[PDB]
Amino acid sequence: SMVNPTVFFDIAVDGEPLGRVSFELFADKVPKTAENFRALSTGEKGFGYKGSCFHRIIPGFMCQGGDFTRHNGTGGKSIYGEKFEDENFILKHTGPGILSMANAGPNTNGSQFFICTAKTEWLDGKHVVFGKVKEGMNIVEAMERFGSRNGKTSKKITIADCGQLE
Amino acid sequence: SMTEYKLVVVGADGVGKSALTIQLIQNHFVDEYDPTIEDSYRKQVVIDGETCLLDILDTAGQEEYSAMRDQYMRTGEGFLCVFAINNTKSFEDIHHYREQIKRVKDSEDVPMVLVGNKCDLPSRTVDTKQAQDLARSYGIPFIETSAKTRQGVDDAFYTLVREIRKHKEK
Ligand SMILES: CCn1c(-c2cccnc2[C@H](C)OC)c2c3cc(ccc31)-c1cc(O)cc(c1)C[C@H](NC(=O)[C@H](C1CCCC1)N(C)C(C)=O)C(=O)N1CCC[C@H](N1)C(=O)OCC(C)(C)C2
Ligand SMILES: Nc1nc2c(ncn2[C@@H]2O[C@H](COP(=O)(O)OP(=O)(O)NP(=O)(O)O)[C@@H](O)[C@H]2O)c(=O)[nH]1
Ligand SMILES: [Cl-]
Ligand SMILES: [Mg+2]
Structure with missing residues (x-):
């Protein structure tokens, strides 16, 4: 926080403002992965999260988003190329x-990522944890309510705006 | 009267499980990839003059969550084991499904059909003979399908129902 950057998503539900979620990105421990998410949040490389959808939301588990290339849950790309290696598994779910x-x-x-809404320890060692919600967990909980058992959302949940908070 | 069959569609990611199911249910080909978590469908059909209700469980290709996958297999009466003819890994994955089905259901004789999907594509890596030989070694039918052209789609599901019925006669 003296070290880790903070980014925000302004979340929309069918275009209407829901609220802001901010994240601390753990650059101190996961720098390459944190930097990817930071840059995708500011759009400074010419592409990123702005306008993309939380396409898969399963209550009790997670809100997943970040496919800004295929817009269908199969795509995304990093600031390093299409894909990048698992940086470390220091942090757990x-x-x-x-x-x-x-x-x-x-x-x-x-670029695809997920926000846990519960402990998901079975993903430890397989998915790189790199940040945590700072403010707006209530907004994440609001998003979670639009999901369903099969991940389909009852309204379209988008990142209407995003960026870095100094 | 009628009967009802619990059919479970299994196979590796992207082989066409959902596209096959959607062709059977909705008579159209989904060109896009929408990765499944889990979906269920029902359809009333007549097979060999006998009316039945098909309950189709369209599973995800993922193989974690063994507790859920074991339950799919316990409840399922017959299994469509799908690979793609242009994906050798998906074909190599088939025996894992058969072994897991036999284990969960505590039986060496479980109704199953081996389905080689995407037969419309020019990029084949799995020979028909290779899949026929595997199916023969299991004693199960092998059906080549294309969810895109609809070739073999009804045949795959109806053959699975015939396999369940044959199994119930024992
Ligand atoms: C058996 C049913 N079942 C369950 C499950 C388990 C226990 C109890 N009840 C359930 C559900 C509610 O019973 C309906 C899960 C589950 C997950 C999948 C399928 C069925 C699943 C699944 C399907 C996929 O297609 C992909 C994944 C899981 C992994 C997913 N990767 C992708 O999306 C990738 C894209 C990202 C990179 C670019 C491509 N992609 C499309 C493929 C093909 O790899 C991923 O990284 N995550 C994050 C962490 C979270 C993960 N998704 C998830 O959704 O977990 C759901 C829960 C926790 C509920 C796990
Ligand atoms: N040419 C062709 N494409 C097919 C065929 N069947 C499926 N596809 C395509 O292959 C992709 C994956 O199909 P899909 O049915 O979603 O596969 P799945 O086995 O259900 N994947 P999952 O395990 O993630 O749920 C889609 O782009 C679909 O259009 C087929 O017979 N021919
Ligand atoms: Cl998973
Ligand atoms: Mg599917």
């Missing part, structure tokens, strides 16, 4: 608010 990379197996990090 210890409870609600944990911010962690989605993947399709080893070393397939791109």
Whole structure:
């Protein structure tokens, strides 16, 4: 916080403002993965999260988003190329608010990520944890209510704006 | 009257489990990839003159969550084991499904159909003979399908129902 950057998402539900979620990104322990998420949040590389959708929300588990390339849950890309390796597994999925990379197996990090709404310890050692919700966990809980058992959302949940808080 | 069958569609990610199911249910080909968590469908059909209700459980290709996957197999009466003809790994994955089904259901004879999907594509890596030989070694049917053209779709599901019925006769 003296060290770790803070980024925000302004969340929309069918275009309407829901609220702001901010995240502490653990650059102190997961610098490459934190830096990817930071840069995708500011859009400074010319692409990123702004406008993208939380496509998969399963109550009791997580809110997953970040596919800004295919817009269908299969895509995304990093600031380093299409994919980048698992940086470390120092941090674990210890409870609600944990911010962690989605993947399709080893070393397939791109831009998709998930926000835990519960402890998901079975993902430890397979998904790189790199941040946590700072403010706006109530907004994440509001988002979670739009999900369903199969991940489909009852309204479209988007990142209407995003950026870095100094 | 009628009967009801619990069919479970299994196979590796992206082989076409959902596309096959959606062709059976909705008679259209989903061109896009929408990765499944879990979906269920019902359809009333007549197979060999006998009306039945098909309960189709469309599973995700993922193989974690063994407790959930074991339950899918306990409840399922017959299994469509799908690979893609242009994905050798998905074909190599087939025996893991058969072994897990036999284990969960405590039986060496479980109704199953081996499905080689995406037969419309020019990128084949798994020979028909290779899949026929595997199916013969299991004593189960093998059906080549294309969810895109609809070739073999009804045949795959109806054959699975026939396999369940044959099993119930024992
Ligand atoms: C058996 C049913 N079942 C369950 C499950 C378990 C126990 C109890 N009840 C359930 C559900 C509620 O019973 C309906 C889960 C589950 C997950 C999948 C399928 C069925 C699942 C699943 C399906 C996928 O297609 C992909 C994944 C899981 C992993 C996912 N990767 C992707 O999305 C990637 C993209 C990201 C990189 C680019 C590609 N991709 C599409 C593929 C093909 O790899 C991922 O990284 N995460 C984050 C961490 C979270 C993960 N998703 C998840 O959704 O977990 C759900 C829960 C926790 C409930 C686990
Ligand atoms: N050409 C062709 N494409 C197919 C065929 N069946 C499926 N596809 C395509 O392959 C992709 C994956 O299909 P899908 O049915 O979602 O696969 P799945 O086995 O259900 N994947 P999952 O395990 O993630 O749920 C989609 O782009 C779909 O259009 C087929 O017979 N031919
Ligand atoms: Cl998972
Ligand atoms: Mg599917």
